[PDB]
Design a protein around this ligand. Sequence first.
Ligand SMILES: O=C(O)c1ccc(N2CCN(c3cccc(C(F)(F)F)c3)CC2)c(NC(=O)c2ccc(F)cc2)c1
Ligand SMILES: Nc1nc2c(ncn2[C@@H]2O[C@H](COP(=O)(O)OP(=O)(O)OP(=O)(O)O)[C@@H](O)[C@H]2O)c(=O)[nH]1
Ligand SMILES: [Cl-]
Ligand SMILES: [Cl-]
Ligand SMILES: [Mg+2]
Lengths: 996, 209, 120
Amino acid sequence: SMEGILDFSNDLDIALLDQVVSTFYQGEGVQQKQAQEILTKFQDNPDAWEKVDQILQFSTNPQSKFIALSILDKLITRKWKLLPNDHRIGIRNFVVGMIISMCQDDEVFKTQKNLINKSDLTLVQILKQEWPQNWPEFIPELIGSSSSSVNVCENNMIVLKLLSEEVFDFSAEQMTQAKALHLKNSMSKEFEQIFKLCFQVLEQGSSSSLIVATLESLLRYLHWIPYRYIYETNILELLSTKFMTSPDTRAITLKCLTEVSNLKIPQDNDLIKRQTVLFFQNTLQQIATSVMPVTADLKATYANANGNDQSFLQDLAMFLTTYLARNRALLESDESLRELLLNAHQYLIQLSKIEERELFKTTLDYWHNLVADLFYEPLKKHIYEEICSQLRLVIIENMVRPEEIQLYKSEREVLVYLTHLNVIDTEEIMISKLARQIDGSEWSWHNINTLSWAIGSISGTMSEDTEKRFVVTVIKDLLGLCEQKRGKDNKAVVARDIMYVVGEYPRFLKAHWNFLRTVILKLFEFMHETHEGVQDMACDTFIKIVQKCKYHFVIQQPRESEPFIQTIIRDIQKTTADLQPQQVHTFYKACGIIISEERSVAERNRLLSDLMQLPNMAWDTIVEQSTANPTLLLDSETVKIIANIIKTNVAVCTSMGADFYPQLGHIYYNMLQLYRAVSSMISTQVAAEGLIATKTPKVRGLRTIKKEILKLVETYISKARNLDDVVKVLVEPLLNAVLEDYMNNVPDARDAEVLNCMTTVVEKVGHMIPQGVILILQSVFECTLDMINKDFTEYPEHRVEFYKLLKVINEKSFAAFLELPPAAFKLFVDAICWAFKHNNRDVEVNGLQIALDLVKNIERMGNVPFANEFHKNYFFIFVSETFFVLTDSDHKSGFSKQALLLMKLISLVYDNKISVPLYQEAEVPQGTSNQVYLSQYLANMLSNAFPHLTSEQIASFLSALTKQCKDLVVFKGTLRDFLVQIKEVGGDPTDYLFAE
Amino acid sequence: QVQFKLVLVGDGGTGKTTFVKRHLTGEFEKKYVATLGVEVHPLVFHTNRGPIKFNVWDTAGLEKFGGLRDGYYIQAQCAIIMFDVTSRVTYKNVPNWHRDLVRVCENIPIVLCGNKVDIKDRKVKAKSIVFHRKKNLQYYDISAKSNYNFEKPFLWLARKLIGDPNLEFVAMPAAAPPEVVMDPALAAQYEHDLEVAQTTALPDEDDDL
Amino acid sequence: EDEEVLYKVRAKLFRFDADAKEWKERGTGDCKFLKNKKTNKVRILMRRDKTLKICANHIIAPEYTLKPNVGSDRSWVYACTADIAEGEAEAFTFAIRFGSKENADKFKEEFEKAQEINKK
Ligand SMILES: O=C(O)c1ccc(N2CCN(c3cccc(C(F)(F)F)c3)CC2)c(NC(=O)c2ccc(F)cc2)c1
Ligand SMILES: Nc1nc2c(ncn2[C@@H]2O[C@H](COP(=O)(O)OP(=O)(O)OP(=O)(O)O)[C@@H](O)[C@H]2O)c(=O)[nH]1
Ligand SMILES: [Cl-]
Ligand SMILES: [Cl-]
Ligand SMILES: [Mg+2]
């Protein structure tokens, strides 16, 4: 029976609508859901707007009226200009009348805020259409109607707030540039009268709900009004005294004073400087006397979360940081403003102790600005000594782990600046916090961790001598703390923090070889501790120390028989015997970093040979047994050994790059034979067991071997220095091993990593292997396109790697596309346009870049038959495909590159840089310029796609577009204007003449 | 038991439905099926202050599937605004969702959630996310996929709605489960159903669990 | 608690949805084998990380058999006739996955020990 309202042939039963709406808002389960669907179909009926004035008059349900206003809003915003003037004036007067009537009834004003606010927004949508050109008296009549009633006055403040938001805050995306400018100038022209009314209400006072609504509208005005309305009236004084004293007005007043602090203000005027000081002094005095003194425990207050305390304290942090970041110099050179300056900063110290991450970050951004200033600005640090001392304790007690990247960075930078400003105070706070870990008073895992992160963060800031004494003191103390602690949980925590601290002080390690040596040998002992976190931390600390101190492992240190790298390699089996595979790979990666420091080739190659001894011997015995009998691979355990050998090679190649070549050369031939043998096993497992085989641990293990081989080759080729050897030794066996295997596997068995490996090969040596690039395209192009051209979802990794490969081929070896037969070239153009339609931002962006690069590649060919045949066949396909993704609202992330592509395409024709006619003969006079025909083709295309536009709108848009096809920012402006106009009927064609 | 209307808003594909479903059933839905208008689901948490029920209005982010739009916000007592940290446009649209929401719901606790922080290539950097500050929104980095901070939006809203800053999620005692006898008539039924299930692969076999 | 913890292991639990012919995750957290100190009956009790909501609550019935999943070397699938995690006792096809083959094999050992305790 609910479906009754969807039958428009019969007059609407308001009592039935009221029941559906009640069922939706107050009902449950299946009933709610059905009411939901019916209400949506009702609202979306294009004639539903004719039912609105009936529902507004005769409904008892305020939710029905709300939904009626939503229906009205779709008409006003999309189709308003289709209505006769009489009908528009009728709706306008009904809406004003309904608002005034609801406001004059005290009961309705109190209880129907939802429906009044929705009515106010509906009126503002009418103003955007009608005002001021067709409604010059609106503002005068609103000002007039405001003295008739306190309810109407308060509601008029809501209307003016929403108007200001719609015109100044949200216009950029929702209106044409010309229409936004028109409404801004219109509000600007009449603001004097609006302000007069707002000031009177604030002066005349009385009703708090009216005062709050007026201050809410002022917050919006402050985004755009000139400073003189604030500084040349009593308003600064009222905001910073009266409105700070009462808690109803205090939150909004603080937000107003924050925006006052951001007004554009003359810089060379002592009276304005004094007014800026005064409102700050007044605001802080009202806080200290009516809210809380400077000493108050804001951490405790915030935590207790009474009433609006949390929002108030957030707003105070925003006010203090905004004002002081701009104005603290106003308070710094006058002795009588010193107390105000330090009290403001003392409130910020108290706010900084609140346990609230997002508030802490806001105060931390201010502290960064201040201590950066004290670091560089002459004669300022002494002012803030006591503020800085308290801030050192706040930052040290709040230090997060370096894994929280941005917050750790911000904290580190503040602490480094503070350490420079007073190294003795920083050291004393850190040593005394350590003492309270040792005496147990502040002991916990969190507390020793946070302190260790803080101590780590200031490495490099002290003089080498001060650092030396500090580091020894800290390590001695953490060692004592470790001894003192009982049970492996506690000891592991302190051991990880010792490893952490030592790893952060490379300058100290580099100066003290005996210390560094002991640290490494101690890290090697910890690599045998199965206690959770200890092996991982030992390996992470080892590679971190090696990255910073590698030179010390590659020279012979005095009183050593050999470079320490030889000692590490000699004992590597024993050292790594208890590590998990990923930890062994880190260890081998670290050794690779050291070995790359050796610039003697013979000695480097020998260290590399010695490091790879264990994986090379495991490899050799497998290749002997594996080739002697192929069936030995099927064994789960051998697959794991082979993958871990390849991963060890990847790890060492990651740190050695070009230097890795001799080791790659040792395994290369048998590694590509193993790639082929594993490929056979996957193929015949899929044949025997079905596509499900690709999910089995055995086939995933085999595929891991193929992916690590491709990863090893891409890792080497991406860092290779000798490209002649890459082309002469590596490329041919690689293409033979991987391309046909990729092509001749079923989609589900094809490795996307093949596309990734080929991208690096084309990137690095594409110019040197034209025939190899042709072979890459022939093997991967059509079979990969067929995997990804059925939907936007299947084979997401192939999708991404496919367009990265086409992008690099189109940049480096475009001749490979000239070699394609016409039908394959057509599939390439189809593939590019397919990329444009993607919502996945990786593919879409590569798609548009390939299109740009392709146009550039064709332009480069000059006036020749392939270029001419490209334009004749594809120019209009690229223009229409680009316009499609510009206008369909489903591809907004690609806007910039769509615009750049369309600009290139239009500029080609505007410059007469296309030699042949784009039209086929007897379609237009044979003289006809490509410019005239492009005009005609676009006018026709836009007219059919957007039949509600006038010929005038389309012609003006295209006239603007072609004139602006050398000015990207203006062109984009015109495109955005067009995207606004296609959403409505009767868009003004003169909007496309806009100039700033 | 106290029940509060929670409205979930944000761009299409930001993870609103995924996040709710994970909370309702524990499942991770990999597929994008765009919400049509709104989906309403009751969601209960057990706290040291007793059970709290959220009536979750999971709204459509796509304009063409928007349905009643701000009609869904009427009498909301709390809200989540969702964006995707892998999609800059979804953060650019946060002020538009906030505008439409607070025009209907003027004084409600609101959490801003940056979803999909599990994805390595993050596009909306920590430094860029400041919109919550002047609007007094709580902010969390979340992942519906890794469960990073997955409970935080509800725990924060529960503290705000109950007015107890020390409210915690608790474990409800688990009843002794029944001892039953396998029906001899449906023993053939069960071997079939188990065959289908053994030969369908578990998803995400590369994850830590 | 009126129960002794015999075994605790981190796990992800799935239930098979026959309609969508797919595995749907039900929760991640500590899977516990709990021995009732009154009846000596051993149950699986599993709670989700952070919400602590129950995703498994059933007797380790002697008639249950742990089978491999085709996809995994660190999972078991078994039919459960009466799980009360979501309330009303329901039959599920469950799959439980662990951090390693070793965790999965240890789980199987413990699950059999519990089946024998439940036979008494
Ligand atoms: O001057 C030297 O030749 C010298 C040699 C070694 C030192 N050590 C620093 C390395 N060390 C250490 C102890 C346990 C763990 C670690 C860790 F691996 F870094 F975690 C390092 C403790 C020994 C230190 N540093 C000390 O502070 C120290 C050394 C020995 C002691 F008995 C007491 C202090 C100095
Ligand atoms: N990587 C990753 N993907 C996620 C995450 N959360 C959701 N997704 C995926 O995002 C896609 C969209 O999720 P939905 O929940 O349908 O998005 P929505 O916001 O409800 O979309 P609309 O209903 O159109 O507004 C799905 O493919 C999800 O699996 C996350 O935390 N990480
Ligand atoms: Cl300044
Ligand atoms: Cl339209
Ligand atoms: Mg959804």
